[PDB]
Amino acid sequence: GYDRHITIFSPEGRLYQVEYAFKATNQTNINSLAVRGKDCTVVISQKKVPDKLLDPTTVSYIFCISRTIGMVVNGPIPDARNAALRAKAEAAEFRYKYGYDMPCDVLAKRMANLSQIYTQRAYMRPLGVILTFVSVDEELGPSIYKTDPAGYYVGYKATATGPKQQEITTNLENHFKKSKIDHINEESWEKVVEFAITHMIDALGTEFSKNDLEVGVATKDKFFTLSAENIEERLVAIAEQ
């Protein structure tokens, strides 16, 4: 079965290399989560630093793609950085060609089209990553758009990705059943970050220190990541609740 080694159809109409690329997605054993506020979009991901010899500051799976767009990756870091560099280049070229900042959903589509090609063309393998793009779009407002190795993409009210993704997903589903709305009805991003961390704690059943987490925030006209000290402030605020 050489139909299992390259991206051609199997007799049941399946692409095993694409399916096996989805399995590489969880190789890092990290879970990510994204939600939308009124003004903002927050993305949180677990930060696991096993080796003591590592420089913890260099260990990251969140990327600043453009001034406005941020991206968290679920998958091995080489493929992750490969996708990050490409997305940065694509976002820059878009601005140069068309005279405005590339929207989150359009970058998502473009990267999804790129992933689709690897599923159809044989010489290119799929990247073993899932890319969650976040921004506050100037037309669409707070935005989450996610890409996978199949070349599939869609916008989300909120989303999660990783080994224990389903727990987090249903946790969020249940909140939006109750809340009755499309987003976190909150003024400040600080409290939306607090929501994100809180519901991650419930769904995973685990506690986090400042160095166990990684947080990206998108507001109007900038996406930025939080330092450990900014996260510690956030954890403290949750504990005093």
Q: Which of residues 119-178 bind another protein (CB under 8 A)?
A: 119-126, 128, 145, 150-152, 154-159, 169, 172-173, 176
Cβ proximity to Mg ion, 117 vs 236, nearer residue: 117
Cβ proximity to Mg ion, 114 vs 238, nearer residue: 114
Q: Which of residues 51-80 bind another protein (CB under 8 A)?
A: 52-55, 57-59, 76-79
Stretch that binds Cl ion, among 32-40, 107-115, 132-140, 194-202 (CB under 5 A): 107-115
Q: CA-CA-CA-CA torsion for 87, 46, 230, 181, nearest 10 degrees?
A: 80
Environment class of residue 57 by beta-carbon count within 10 Å: exposed (0-12), middle (13-18) or buried (19+)?
A: exposed
CA–CA distances in Å: residue 214 to residues 179, 209, 226: 26, 11, 7
Cα gap 162→74, rounded to integer Å: 7
Cα gap 3→7, rounded to integer Å: 7
9 binds another protein (CB under 8 A): yes
Closest CA to 92 of 74, 65, 53: 65
201 binds another protein (CB under 8 A): no
> Which residue type occupies 140?
L
- State the DSSP H helix or E strand holding residue 237, giving kind and residue range, or none if neither: helix 228-239
φ and ψ of 212, to 5 deg? -90, -10
Stretch that binds Cl ion, among 45-53, 105-113, 141-149, 192-200 (CB under 5 A): 105-113
Number of residues that bind Cl ion (CB under 5 A): 2
113 binds Cl ion (CB under 5 A): yes
Which residues of this chain interact with Cl ion, rule CB under 5 A? Answer: 110, 113
Which residues of this chain interact with another protein, rule CB under 8 A? Answer: 2, 4-14, 16-17, 20-27, 52-55, 57-59, 76-79, 81-82, 85, 105, 109, 112-113, 115-117, 119-126, 128, 145, 150-152, 154-159, 169, 172-173, 176
